[PDB]
Structures are given as C-alpha cells and as structure tokens.
Amino acid sequence: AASLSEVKLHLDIEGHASHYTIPWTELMAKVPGLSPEALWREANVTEDLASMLNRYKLIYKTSGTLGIALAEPVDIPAVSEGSMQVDASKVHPGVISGLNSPACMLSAPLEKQLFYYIGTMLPNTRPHSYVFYQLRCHLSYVALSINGDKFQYTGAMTSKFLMGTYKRVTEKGDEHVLSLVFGKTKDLPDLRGPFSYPSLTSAQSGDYSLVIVTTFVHYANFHNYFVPNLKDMFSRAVTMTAASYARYVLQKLVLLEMKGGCREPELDTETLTTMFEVSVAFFKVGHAVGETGNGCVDLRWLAKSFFELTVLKDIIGICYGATVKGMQSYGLERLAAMLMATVKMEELGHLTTEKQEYALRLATVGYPKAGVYSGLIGGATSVLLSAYNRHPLFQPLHTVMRETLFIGSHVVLRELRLNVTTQGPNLALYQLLSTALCSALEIGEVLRGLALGTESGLFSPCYLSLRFDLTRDKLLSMAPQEATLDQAAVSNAVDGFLGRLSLEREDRDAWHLPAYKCVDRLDKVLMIIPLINVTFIISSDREVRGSALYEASTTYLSSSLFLSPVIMNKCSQGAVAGEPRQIPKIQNFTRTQKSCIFCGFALLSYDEKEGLETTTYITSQEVQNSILSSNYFDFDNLHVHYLLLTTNGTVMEIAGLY
Amino acid sequence: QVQLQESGPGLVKPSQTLSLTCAISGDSVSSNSATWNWIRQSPSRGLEWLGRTYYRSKWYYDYAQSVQNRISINPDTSKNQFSLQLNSVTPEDMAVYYCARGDFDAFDFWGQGLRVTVSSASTKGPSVFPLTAALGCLVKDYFPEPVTVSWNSGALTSGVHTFPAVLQSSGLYSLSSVVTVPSSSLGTQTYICNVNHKPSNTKVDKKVEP
Amino acid sequence: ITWVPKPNVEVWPVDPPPPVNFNKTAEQEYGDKEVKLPHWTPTLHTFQVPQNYTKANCTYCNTREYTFSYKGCCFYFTKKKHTWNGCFQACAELYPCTYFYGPTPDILPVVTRNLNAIESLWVGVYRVGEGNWTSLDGGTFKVYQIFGSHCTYVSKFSTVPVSHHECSFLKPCLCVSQRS
Amino acid sequence: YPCCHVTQLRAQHLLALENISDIYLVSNQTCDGFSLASLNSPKNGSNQLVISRCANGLNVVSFFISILKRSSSALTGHLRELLTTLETLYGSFSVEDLFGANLNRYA
Amino acid sequence: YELTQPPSVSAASGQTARITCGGDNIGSKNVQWYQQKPAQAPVLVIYADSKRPSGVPERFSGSNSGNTATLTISGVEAGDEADYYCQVWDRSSNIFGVGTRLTVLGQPKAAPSVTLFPPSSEELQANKATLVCLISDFYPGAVTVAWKADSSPVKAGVETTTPSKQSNNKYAASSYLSLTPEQWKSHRSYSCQVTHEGSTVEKT
Ligand SMILES: *[C@@H]1O[C@H](CO)[C@@H](O[C@@H]2O[C@H](CO)[C@@H](O[C@@H]3O[C@H](CO)[C@@H](O)[C@H](O)[C@@H]3O)[C@H](O)[C@H]2NC(C)=O)[C@H](O)[C@H]1NC(C)=O
Ligand SMILES: *[C@@H]1O[C@H](CO)[C@@H](O)[C@H](O)[C@H]1NC(C)=O
Ligand SMILES: *[C@@H]1O[C@H](CO)[C@@H](O)[C@H](O)[C@H]1NC(C)=O
Ligand SMILES: *[C@@H]1O[C@H](CO)[C@@H](O)[C@H](O)[C@H]1NC(C)=O
Ligand SMILES: *[C@@H]1O[C@H](CO)[C@@H](O)[C@H](O)[C@H]1NC(C)=O
Ligand SMILES: *[C@@H]1O[C@H](CO)[C@@H](O)[C@H](O)[C@H]1NC(C)=O
C-alpha cells in the first residue's frame, strides 16, 4: 500500500544509551486502522519552536485543576446464578421465556451493536486540529442545532471517553467553538504537540477527568453566557448511577420545556449544561457496559437504563430536534419484545409492582416506535386500572405509584401523538382514570414538586387527564399554601402546569376522543368523561351536539354547568335546543348496596360557585363500598352537589339516602 | 404670523344649540403637528377645556367628560377654520369661549375669545348720549354685552379710557368712555365717538360738540 | 328505578404482538456502519436600516389606550408579540405617528418599572454596520452587548439595553408617539 | 554532538517517513529546548556528511506515543518498555521553560 | 389629576416671586404655565416645565420635580400682576389650575382722579336723568361710593361697578345715579363722593 518499513529510535536516557527498532511493516498488518504516515503528516515534525509556542499560547489553559475525591457507583450488578447468557447477535427464538427467568446479555456482542457505527470523532476543525490527533473509531453521537442553526452541539462518545463540542456562529460569521472531554484519565484521547492534559483538565478524580479544549478568545466569548459548575457536573457524572443521571437530565429538560426552551431556546448556562449532560447519560450507559470486561449484564439493568435512554431520545427530538446515532442494540429490542409475548397485557396490573415496571420498561425498549405493537396500551391501562382500585380515593399519589405509572405512560403518550390509532377505547380508559386521579390534593403535590424541583413534578395523572377546567386562578386556589416555599416559584409552577395541559399544540391533549368532533365551542369545555357506550361532555355553553342537554342546579355561577351525553359516540344531528333538562334528584337510596349497581358509572362532585371538584369512576365493588361508606357524601354542604353519570346516558343527582 | 379669531352668535336661549366658528391664518387646519382646541372660562367652572380636533391619517375628534354627548367640533379645510356646536345648553354654559392651537400637552396661541351668555331675553338696542379737560360718551340700557368703542375709527388712541359696563337690576347694561383734551384746545378739531354693538347690528357715530 | 348490577370494569382485549424478525441482516437493521458527523451551515443575513419605516414627523397620543406617558412622549406595549425587525412595521400600524423607540434618552427605568418580573420587551436601539448603537431618534447608546447580533431587549431588572442572540424570538414591542 | 535548530520554510524540501531510518532524540539538559529529532535517511550506501534533518522533539514524541498507544494489541514487551520510556521522556517536557528563552540558539 | 396651586402669592417689586403647583407625580408629566392678565386672553408663558415660547422675558423660569412644579419670576416688574394657571394632561383630561392671583407689592398709593358728568341734553329730553361718576388712576383698587342730593344721603337707585385694572397697572370704576328728570330741579346740586383708603373725595 505505502512503501514504508521499520525505523530505529536512538536515545540516551541514563548515562548509557539504547535503541528501539519499531517495525512499521507487520505492525500495520496487525492493526488495520493504523496509518503512520497520516499521523506523521498530522504532526508538524518540522515545526519551529516559536510556532509551537504560538499554538500553545492560543489554546485556553485551565486556571487550576479541582482535585475532588469521587467514587464510582454500583451500577451493573453481578450475574445472578443461573442467568441465561444471551449473545446479542445470536438471539434464538426460544432463548428464555418468562419475566421471572434470570437472564443476562453478554457484554462484548452488545458493545459491538451499541458502537456498531464507525466514524471520525476528533475532527480537523480548529481548535481540535491543534491539540488532538484525528481519530476514527466506533462511535455514538447525539447532535442538535438550535437558533437557526447558529448554535450547534455535537457530543460524540466511545466506550471510553466523550467529547461534547459547542459551536456558535455570530451574525457576522465568526465561529466560536468550545469542547468538553469527560472520561477515565487513562482512556482520554491521544494528545499532540506540546499540550499535556494536566494544564487542560478542569476537574480530576482518582480515575476520571474533565478537560476543556478551546481557544482563549472563544473561551471569553462563551464565558459571557456559559459559566458552568464544572465541579457539580463532574461529581454527578462520576458518582450518579446511569439511570439516576438520565432521570436527572430528563427532569431538567422537562423544566426547560415548561419555561419554553423548546419553542424559543435561550442560550443560558442551564440550557447548555443540560445539553452536555444528555451526552453524559448516554456515555455512562455505554461506559459501564464496556467496563464490565467480557462479562454479562442482567436484563433488568439494561431495561431500566435503556428505558431512560429512549425517553431522553424522544424528548430531545421533540424539543430541540436532535439526533441520536448508536446506543441501540437490536438484540435487546428483540429479546424485550419476545418477553412481551410471554405476558398478557390485559392483566399486567395483576402482577407485582417490580414485574409491572420491568415489563413496561421492556415494552419501551422493545417497541420504541409507535405502530408496531399497539396493544401495549392495554398493559399500561391495566396497571392504571389496578392502581385506581388500590389507590386511596382522591388522595395524592405516592412516589412508588408515580414512578410505576410514569414508566407506563410513554406508550400512551406516543400513540396519543399519532394521528390514527387502534386502541382508542383503552386510551379513553387511561384518560378517564387520569381525570379521576386528578384531585386538588394531587394538583397541590405536583405544584409543590414543580416549585421545589423534585420528582413529584415529572409525571402526574393530571397531565394526561381530560380536565379542561384548570385555569390559573383555579390552580392558585388548589396551590400549596405552605409558606416555606416561595410563592413566586409556586406561580411559575402554576404557569408550567397550564403549559403541560395546553390544548394549544401539545398533541398529548385532545384528538383521538370520539366525541371531540361533537363540540363547536372547544374553549368552553370543562371535562370529557368517556364511559362505556357513552361519552359525556361537561361544558359551560349549551352548544354541544349530543343526545340530551342537562343543566345542573348552579347558583349564579358564570360557568353554568351543562352536561351533554353522546350515546355510542354518535354526534346527534342538530344541537339540542329549547330548554335544558333538569337533573333528576334521587333521594330514595341505601348505603348498604350488596351488589355493584354503579359498576361502570361516574360520580362527580361540584360546587355551585367554585366548579367541578371530584371525579370518580366506579371500577369495582370495593370502590362503590368506599364511596358509600365514607365522608364523601356530606349532604349538609348545600353548595356541593353530587351527580351520577350512567352508561345508559342519564345524569341523576344523589341528594339523599333515606 | 400665527393668528385665529372666533365668531358666531353670542346669545343662546336655554336648551337650544350653541354654534361658533374659529378662523385661522398663518397655519393649516390640516397641520400634522398641532391640534385645534375649544376652551371655555367661567367663574362657576373655572378654566375647562371643552374639546379638540386634528388631522393625521384621518380626522380625529376628542371631547371632554362634561359635554361628551353634547359637543361636536367639525373642521373646514376650504376656509381653513373649525366650528363648535353644543346642544342642550344650560345656564352653566354661560362663559367666555376661546379657541387655541396646541400640541396635546400645551396650548400655544389663543383666540380673542367671545362671551356667550344665556338668559332667553331678547336683544335690546343701546341708547347713546354724549356728555386740562375730558369729554366722553355714555351708553345706557342694552342687554347682549359686549360693545366696542372707538374715536375717529382708531385715529386717536392716547388719552382714551373705556370703562367696563355695569349690569342694572333690570338686567340691561350701561358703559361710558372718555378722552382727555387740553383745556386750551377746547374748540380745535373735531372728535367723533364711534359705538358698535354687534348682537343688534348697530353702529352709530356721535360727534362731540361742546 | 330498576337497578341491575353491572360487572366489574376490565381492560378491552388487545391483539397479540407480531413476531420479531431474527432473519434481519443487522447490516440493514442499522445502516452502513460508516458515519459522518453532522455539520450545519447557517445562512448569514445582513441587517440594514429598514428605511421604509422610520421616525415620524407627526405628533399624536391615543390618550385612552396608551400604556404609559412621560413628559412629551406616549408609550405603548404591543399586545401581540412580534419579531424584533418586524416591529418597525408593528409600531407604525398600531396607532398614527408611532414608531420603534430606543429607551435611554427617555430613561428606561420607567419602562422597566411597567413590566412584570419575567416578561421581556424588544426595544429600538440597533447597529446597522459595526458602528455605534443608535435608534431612530439617533445618538449613541451604552449597551450590554454579549452577542454578535443587532437586536436588543429589556426586562424588569435591566439597567441598560441588552443585546439578544436570536432576533427571531417573539416578544412585545415598545412603541412611541411624540407630542412636540 | 551540539544540537540543531528547526526550519521548515525551505520550499520543495520534501520529507517522508518511508525514507527515515534513524531518529535521534535528545534527553534532559542536553539541549534544554527539547529540539530532539535528528531524522537520518537510510545509510546503506551514501558515505557520510549531512543527510539528516532537524525536527521538533515534542511533536515526534507525541506521534510515537500515539502510534504505540493505537497498537497496544500488537505491542510486544520491548515496544511496551519503549512506550513507557518515551512517555516519561514526554513527561520531562516544559513548555513554560521556552517562554522566556529567545530561541534560535543554534544559528 | 388634582392640580393644587396657592390661591394668592405676594412679592415685592424686584424680589423673585415663586408660584407653586402640586399634584401626584406631576414631575412625571409636562407642566405648562399660562399667564392671564386681567381682561385678556390666556397666553402661554412657560411650556415643557422650562421651555419658553418666543418673546417671553427670561425672568420667567420653570421647574418640575416629584409633586411640586415652581414658576419663578425673577424680575417682577410691571405687567406681571396677573392670574397664573398651571396645566397638565392626566389621561383623557386637561386639568387647569384653580388660579394664583399675583400681587406686585411696592407700588405707591396713587391718589384717585374723579370726574362727574351731568344728565346730557338728549337724556334730559327724554324721561331719564343719569349722573356718571368716573374714578380712575388709583391704587389700591378699593373704593366705596355714595351720593348726596344736598348733604342728605340716598340709598336707592344707584349702580356701581367693580374696580377694573388699567393699562398702567392702575384701577378705575364707574358709578351711575339714575333718577327722573323731575327730581333734578328739586335739590340745588348733586354730589358724588368716594372714600379711598380712608380719605374722601367729592365732586358736584
Ligand atoms: C507547520 O509548519 C509551520 C510551523 O508551524 C506552519 O507555518 C506557519 O504558519 C503561520 C500561519 O500562517 C505563519 O504565520 C504567518 O506569518 C506571516 C508573516 O509573514 C503573517 O503574514 C501571517 O498572517 C501569519 O501570521 C508562520 O509564519 C509559519 N511558520 C513558519 C513558516 O515557520 C504551518 O502552518 C504548519 N502547518 C500545520 C498544518 O500546522
Ligand atoms: C356497550 O355497547 C355494546 C355494543 O358494542 C352493547 O352490546 C353492551 O350492552 C353495552 N354495555 C353496557 C354495559 O351497556
Ligand atoms: C414598504 O415596502 C412595501 C413593499 O412590499 C411597499 O408595498 C410599502 O408601500 C412600503 N411602505 C411604504 C410606507 O410605502
Ligand atoms: C460613535 O460615537 C462617538 C461619540 O460617542 C464618535 O466619536 C464616533 O465617531 C462614532 N462612531 C460612529 C461609527 O458613528
Ligand atoms: C525516498 O527514497 C527513494 C529511494 O532513495 C526515492 O526513490 C524516493 O523518491 C524518496 N522519496 C521522497 C519523498 O523523497
Ligand atoms: C528533566 O528536567 C525537568 C526540568 O528541569 C525536571 O523537572 C525533571 O525531573 C527531569 N527529569 C530527568 C529524568 O532528568
């Protein structure tokens, strides 16, 4: 190929001297990617010392290296005794059936699939040309471009190190560029010329390091808008578990969405730091897999980590329009979908919380795209149904339940974002049960989490509910009155809550509902209750194409409560005119109903001045018993009335129980 | 030279409509950087700005609260003037009306201003009579004030003093005006006292012969 | 009146999942393993003075619908958010004899007083070439410039006009009408 | 022997690894400035005198460190010992030590 | 909105005079000062707090701050005796001042000049008789008038006017004694009397 042979290096280290004969022949045949002449060209061997010094004097050198002492987490577990060793390439149709089956995916094939793509990581783009030797290797990249392609971030990762390159193009055309390299000190990319990492490492642990590569001028320009907490970032990276880091980034990105960073991406420290941390999360997963060292990774760890990675992928694609090449193993996807065939979605909630979470994670990793297996929604709804049956009625959601349901929500959200779907009924079940779980107490807990930047704000059933009554004022009434929390943060949380529930855009709102095309004034709608055989629409205006028009006994409330039933989701030709019907008050009733008479009905409590308070879907006799034998019915309060919505389509009013 | 003068009927019956017009000169009614304002002054209401009009892209009219439903201010580009109409006038509307130029904030250059009175009473003709040394001319019993007095059509100005009228119990007004001539110059030249009362279309010249 | 007991609620049945292709080539499951890292080329757009829109020689003040007045100027906040450049138009079409303003000659502390603690406001001080920051009223301006761009905004806490990074963002606009 | 000075401005003076047989790198104190590359053409029949080119020691050492790193699978103990010795030599670098020096100390 | 200005202000001739005008945030607005001399149309004397229209003495100056706006006349000569009004524009309303009457102290107590006019020939030819008393060129402008038919007083049928400022910043007034011509030949001669600042001046 190239007429190159051996060479001898002579040196006089100690008093005596010695030589070393490095044969470029045979060594080129042992390492196929080696091109010694290319690196010789890269190295300005004939560089005058002055020009070297100029190169050094142009690259930013750190103002001290923070020597922190951080500890690696316990991420990848040990192989459970009796684990089925799965080669990702040789995935047999019957490897191991059952969610309870111990199974582990072999490290090397998985790495060969995650980092299957090859390409040039370190480019010939100043300043990297000055500092680094160009490297072509198996990579994975996350890349985004915002503000009219003027700001661009490209984070490229191996199984060893990670380089995030930022670039801003000025209006005139000046290009400022700044790169951050995270990875184990030993595994850090090969350096060139006079440059040494010590002078460039911003932070360093016992084994890891964070390096900043840019020119002084570029550094200044960036510093005007980008002052990151290098200590905090480095610490979180080294210490946090892969899943935990990914979830941290997800929360950050959801908070940026609420503040409007998706529509109008602002160039602030938080936004850019989050950009880098995305790449860090993906890298962390890859790094751990690689470090195993020709071992095994339990399918549970792979499920949790890659579920978080999938969620991050879609969120950055919708927000910033980003691309993730790599970090996707067809073996894992296949194995997950296979195990999905071994469970019954309709009864997924009838399993343990652990297995529920495992299966839902496997569903997201195995069927990432919407359109393949649409019955996954069933499984999600199953979990939700089960959760509703065991959840303290109206009370806020517990951390554990919130996590389980958040894991299962993504399937529902993906199919809701589509224009056509097949599991509409089940989707409406999910949304109905979310309206039920959406209580003032829950809203409060979510607003608290949003204001305090905690996990409670990430997901709430309210987010995917059919409640369109929540307005800024209503939210301020249901807001945490704890004085500890700054009310300014509470106000921003209220605004963000409305942002997540914005019928405007936010495809995850109204679309696939079958009675959505029976409303003409979709701004005056308050709640849609999709029951079996019926779709009730509660609104403030009387203009709704329905089978009937009920008016509730409201007392000088501007938002006069109008209930319109749509039987068999059939838009009745012609809006109901004349006078709305009065709600039949039923006072003949008993609390000790031995049979589930209400099973499949809905109970709605409303204040004739404040609005709709509570919604309850009688799913089981247990729920009926709970509602009847509790403090739910306080007929003493003459302002709060209780309405019963039936599958036949009749709205009654529970007002007495003999 | 920016100037502008008011005109119109000075007497208005109760209820009724009040009409006035101000003619300007030295500037354009369609000016891009001005506004034309009607402002009245009365002891009962102080100095109250009635209204204003101007022309930019379209013709805009601004009115005050005290006469929102009763006032109209319409311009006229041909004669370079602008009018003022106030319907359903009351005794509270009895005042001296001025027109002025302005710029939303300040009112630069004012009109002479004409006195509008309301009392339903009819116009009465003024009865004129004649009389170092001084010689004058008296005017008794006239209702619609004011009345202008001159000597030789303004040829003589120094040594002249016109007194302000006075209202009798009956409601009619009276006023006198005197000039000063030396006692040695008693039978020299001739002095003609000109009297002009507009609201009755009266103009009479009384020669003072001692 | 008759009350028949309905059964418990359950999930609607779902079809089983399709089988998963093992015969996939892997080479076609992914793509060609050779990848090039993405590169973007942004279309530079030079900014010149609009000329079509400029300082009006007329005087006006919609006394009933102005946001705030001061000395000899009336100030309006556009209700609809607009682009920075397009606001040159958005001020002229709002009210007669209204135009995009640069705040410091009037002293902007009053403007910043009439804002919320999060809402921004496009202001009308710019720089056509690489010269001084100026407005339609003219003169020079002290500006807290941190980006290359030509546009500027103000916030509740702003002390001086601040240069923005993307002039395409939607924000309300400060427009003025003269009284001189 | 006394050290050399690096000059690349020479046009049409081509340099290729194919025709480089011996690379002499200077050590500490010997030249201080680390001008540590005497590249010598193959000497299988060309008498004596100057056939050598002076070149930058730090760039040459970085190139060799990088190629030995990129071939850790093929490296056999002897070349690994070479890698460690050359890494210590590169660790003996001092870029600050050339800031105050006036350079061209061999012309 | 509430323009509060002192009802009256006084100053000696030559000393600087100050007229104030208060209101909520009047310093945020453009204050205008108009001068109205007695029996004249208002004339803008100060605009935009400090700006002066063409042809206004430099002694006139203006300031505006917070809740107080001051119009200072440094010269205080003749013709400055007038009513001074402040004017502002709060939203859709032009608020004028109540009025500040300026008094120029220092002027000497000029003696009054009185003259009398008997019933004219054409006036006596009809059934009317009017005696005109013309008082002029006197300061302070405060006089009380009384008629004497013949040492004996009368308090019926007499019309007096208000003292009215003259061109030379003096004052004048006109009394009218109306009666029938038959009541002229009754008494010997009628006498007008005017008390000015205590003193009394009569004519017949
Ligand atoms: C490898 O060889 C040399 C050593 O670094 C590099 O040539 C050097 O290039 C710089 C940049 O163009 C030259 O600086 C120039 O100096 C002239 C003075 O006439 C000035 O007009 C330019 O604006 C610029 O500042 C420098 O002189 C030159 N050094 C030499 C010839 O010894 C070459 O670029 C290196 N190549 C790579 C790929 O790194
Ligand atoms: C719901 O509708 C179906 C028709 O699809 C009907 O057969 C069934 O009886 C209805 N269920 C109830 C509980 O009314
Ligand atoms: C501004 O340019 C447009 C070009 O489409 C033109 O139609 C318009 O008339 C211009 N503006 C004015 C005030 O003429
Ligand atoms: C900018 O303003 C300064 C004065 O502040 C002046 O000296 C200079 O010439 C101006 N430059 C341009 C390009 O207008
Ligand atoms: C290298 O040497 C060979 C043989 O001496 C010669 O043919 C070739 O031209 C040389 N190459 C260069 C780049 O000088
Ligand atoms: C080489 O020289 C440097 C600079 O004086 C010194 O720090 C280092 O210890 C020396 N090492 C050896 C092996 O001589």
Method: X-ray
Pair of tokens at residue E183: 């009541």
CA distance readout (Å), B94 to A224, B117, B144: 69, 5, 12
CB atoms within 10 A of CB C19: 10
What residue ranges define each of the domains in chain C, with the CATH number in brackets?
42-180 (3.10.100.10)
Say yes or no: C69 contacts chain E, CB-CB below 8 A.
yes
CA distance readout (Å), C159 to A267, A280, C77, C124, E121: 20, 37, 19, 15, 84
Number of structural domains (chain D) is 1
Residue C112, exposed/middle/buried by CB under 10 A (0-12, 13-18, 19+)?
middle
Q: Do E92 and C63 touch (CB under 8 A)?
A: yes
Report the C-alpha gap between A448 and A489 in whole angstroms: 9
Beta bridge partners, C154, equal C121
Round to the nearest angstrom and report the end-to-end CA distance of chain D: 15
Q: Do E78 and E154 belong together in one domain?
A: no
Q: Do E160 and E191 belong together in one domain?
A: yes
Pairing outcome for strands B114-118 and B11-12: parallel
- At which residue do the structure tokens 């103009």 appear? B203
Contact C124, C49 (CB under 8 A): no
Residue from C180, E41, E85 nearest B110 by CA: E41
E strands of A126-230, at which residues? Answer: 135-138, 140-146, 151-157, 161-169, 175-184, 201-204, 208-214
Resolution (A): 3.4
Return residues 117-156 of B near E (CB < 8 Å).
129-131, 134, 136, 138, 140
Q: Which CATH architecture has domain A49-80+115-293+300-329?
A: Alpha-Beta Complex (3.90)
List of chain E residues whose C-beta atoms are within 8 Å of the C-beta of residue B48 = 96
- At which residue do the structure tokens 């209220």 appear? A494
CA distance readout (Å), A502 to A469, A496, A509: 11, 9, 7
Residue from E67, E35, E61 nearest E48 by CA: E61
Per the omega criterion (within 30 degrees of 0), is the bond before B146 cis? yes
Cβ neighbours of residue A573 under 8 Å, at least 6 residues apart?
A: A545
Contact B166, E130 (CB under 8 A): no
Return the C-alpha torsion angle C154, C158, C163, C169, nearest 10: -40
CA geometry: angle A486, A489, A494, nearest 5 deg: 125
Q: Do E13 and E87 belong together in one domain?
A: yes
Cβ neighbours of residue D92 under 8 Å, at least 6 residues apart?
A: D27, D28
Report the C-alpha gap between E71 and E32 in whole angstroms: 10
List of chain C residues whose C-beta atoms are within 8 Å of the C-beta of residue E89 = 63
**D9 CB less than 6 Å from ligand 5?**
no
Report the C-alpha gap between C84 and A341 in whole angstroms: 56
CA distance readout (Å), A96 to A106, A392, B12, B27, C18: 14, 38, 108, 99, 18
Choosing from A429, A531, A533 the residue with most ligand 2 atoms within 8 A of its CB, the one to mutate for a pocket test is: A533
Pair of tokens at residue E186: 């009754």
The whole domain housing E38 covers: 8-105
Pair of tokens at residue E18: 């100050």
Beta bridge partners, A88, equal none
Q: Do E91 and E153 belong together in one domain?
A: no
**Helix, strand, coil content of chain D in percent (nearest 5):** 30, 10, 60
Q: Residue A533 C-alpha to ligand 2 middle, in angstroms?
A: 6
> Which contiguous run of DSSP H or E holds residue A485?
none
Helix, coil or strand: residue A453: coil
Contact E27, E64 (CB under 8 A): yes
Report domain extents, chain A: 1-34, 49-80+115-293+300-329, 343-512, 526-654
Residue from E102, E86, E72 nearest E2 by CA: E86
* Residue B111: closest C-alpha in chain E: E41
Cβ neighbours of residue D30 under 8 Å, at least 6 residues apart?
A: A12, D3
Helices A353-366 + A330-341 axis angle, to 10: 130
Contact B106, E30 (CB under 8 A): yes
Last residue of a domain, one of E81, E105, E129: E105
- At which residue do the structure tokens 């089988």 appear? C19
Contact A412, A375 (CB under 8 A): no
HEC assignment per residue over chain C: CCCCCCCCCCCCCCCCCCCCCCCCCCCCCCCCCEECCCCCCCCCCCCCCCCCCCCCCCCCCCCCCCCEEEECEEEEECCCCECCCCHHHHHHHHCCCEEECCCHHHCCHHHHHCCCCCCCEEECEECCCCCCCEECCCCCCCCECCCCCCCEEECCCCCCCEECCCCCCCECEEEEEECC
Which chains have 3+ CB pairs within 8 A of D? A
Q: Do E42 and B107 touch (CB under 8 A)?
A: yes
The residue type of E135 is I
Task: Measure in Å the smallest separation between the Cα of A598 and chain C Cα atoms.
Answer: 7
Contact A182, A279 (CB under 8 A): no
Residue A402, exposed/middle/buried by CB under 10 A (0-12, 13-18, 19+)?
buried
Contact A618, A599 (CB under 8 A): yes
Q: Let me know if residue E3 belongs to a domain.
A: no
Report the C-alpha gap between C75 and C95 in whole angstroms: 11
Alpha helices for A60-166 (secondary structure H): 107-114, 128-131
Task: Report the residue from E30, E48, E91 with minimal CB separation from C63.
Answer: E91
Number of structural domains (chain E) is 2
Left if phi > 0, otherwise alpha if psi is -120 to 50, otherwise beta: which for E191?
A: beta
Q: Let me know if residue E1 belongs to a domain.
A: no
Q: What is the DSSP letter of E33?
A: E
Residue from A478, A418, A410, A474 nearest A443 by CA: A478
| Same fold flag, A49-80+115-293+300-329 and A526-654 | no
CA atoms within 13 A on the CB side of B97: 26
How many Å separate Cα E24 from the centre of its chain? 32
Contact C25, A636 (CB under 8 A): no
CA atoms within 13 A on the CB side of A113: 23
Report the C-alpha gap between D35 and D52 in whole angstroms: 14
Per the omega criterion (within 30 degrees of 0), is the bond before E140 cis? yes
Report the C-alpha gap between B160 and B177 in whole angstroms: 8
Contact E139, E108 (CB under 8 A): yes
Cβ neighbours of residue C6 under 8 Å, at least 6 residues apart?
A: A596, A597, A598, A599, A600, A601, A647
| Domain A526-654 superfamily per CATH | Herpesvirus glycoprotein H, C-terminal domain (2.60.40.3190)
Q: Do E100 and E12 belong together in one domain?
A: yes
The residue type of A564 is S
The residue type of A440 is A
Residue from B174, B168, B79, B78 nearest B125 by CA: B174
Task: Measure in Å the smallest separation between the Cα of E3 and chain B Cα atoms.
Answer: 12
What residue ranges define each of the domains in chain B, with the CATH number in brackets?
3-118 (2.60.40.10), 127-208 (2.60.40.10)
Q: Side by side, which strands form the sheet with C73-77?
A: C68-70, C73-77, C174-178, C98-100
Which CATH number is D100's domain given?
Answer: 3.10.390.20
Residue from D52, D96, B158, C38 nearest A61 by CA: D96
Report the C-alpha gap between B75 and B181 in whole angstroms: 48
Last residue of a domain, one of E56, E75, E105: E105
CA distance readout (Å), A141 to A122, A165, A321, B185: 12, 11, 14, 118
Beta bridge partners, B5, equal B23
A-D C-beta contacts closer than 8 Å: 133
Task: Measure in Å the smallest separation between the Cα of E21 and chain B Cα atoms.
Answer: 16
Contact A645, A601 (CB under 8 A): yes
> Residue-wise over C123-139: b if at least 16 C-beta within 10 A, else e?
bbbbbeeeeebbbbbee
Q: Find the radius of gyration of the CA atoms of chain C.
A: 28
Beta bridge partners, A611, equal A607
How many Å separate Cα C142 from the centre of its chain? 21
B-E C-beta contacts closer than 8 Å: 101
Which chains have 3+ CB pairs within 8 A of C? A, B, E
Helix, coil or strand: residue A275: helix
Helix, coil or strand: residue E59: coil
Q: Do E30 and B176 touch (CB under 8 A)?
A: no
List of chain A residues whose C-beta atoms are within 8 Å of the C-beta of residue D53 = 46
Dihedral sign computed on CA atoms, order B64, B69, B71, B77: positive
Report the C-alpha gap between B73 and B51 in whole angstroms: 7
> Which contiguous run of DSSP H or E holds residue A158?
none
Task: Report the residue from A7, A42, A47 with minimal CB separation from D21.
Answer: A7
Q: Do E150 and E96 belong together in one domain?
A: no
Beta bridge partners, C69, equal C74
Pairing outcome for strands B81-89 and B75-76: antiparallel
CA distance readout (Å), D20 to A2, A149, D37, E32: 14, 46, 11, 93
Contact E161, B145 (CB under 8 A): no
Pair of tokens at residue E23: 């209101």
Pairing outcome for strands B107-110 and B95-102: antiparallel
CB atoms within 10 A of CB E93: 14
Last residue of a domain, one of E105, E136, E164: E105
CA geometry: angle A422, A424, A425, nearest 5 deg: 125
Cβ neighbours of residue A452 under 8 Å, at least 6 residues apart?
A: A485, A489
Q: What is the DSSP string of E176-193?
A: EEEE-GGGTSSSS--EEE
Which CATH number is E49's domain given?
Answer: 2.60.40.10
- Atom 4 (ligand 5) nearest CA: D19
List of chain D residues whose C-beta atoms are within 8 Å of the C-beta of residue A30 = 71, 73-74
Say yes or no: A187 contacts chain D, CB-CB below 8 A.
no
Report the C-alpha gap between C75 and C61 in whole angstroms: 9
Report the C-alpha gap between A92 and A370 in whole angstroms: 25
Beta bridge partners, A135, equal A122
Q: Side by side, which strands form the sheet with C162-163?
A: C121-123, C152-154, C162-163
The whole domain housing D19 covers: 2-107
Return the C-alpha torsion angle B96, B101, B104, B105, nearest 10: -70
Task: Measure in Å the smallest separation between the Cα of A606 and chain C Cα atoms.
Answer: 24
CA distance readout (Å), E49 to A282, B117, C61, E76, E86: 67, 35, 19, 20, 10
- At which residue do the structure tokens 């059964």 appear? C7
- At which residue do the structure tokens 């300040």 appear? B106
Beta bridge partners, B49, equal B39
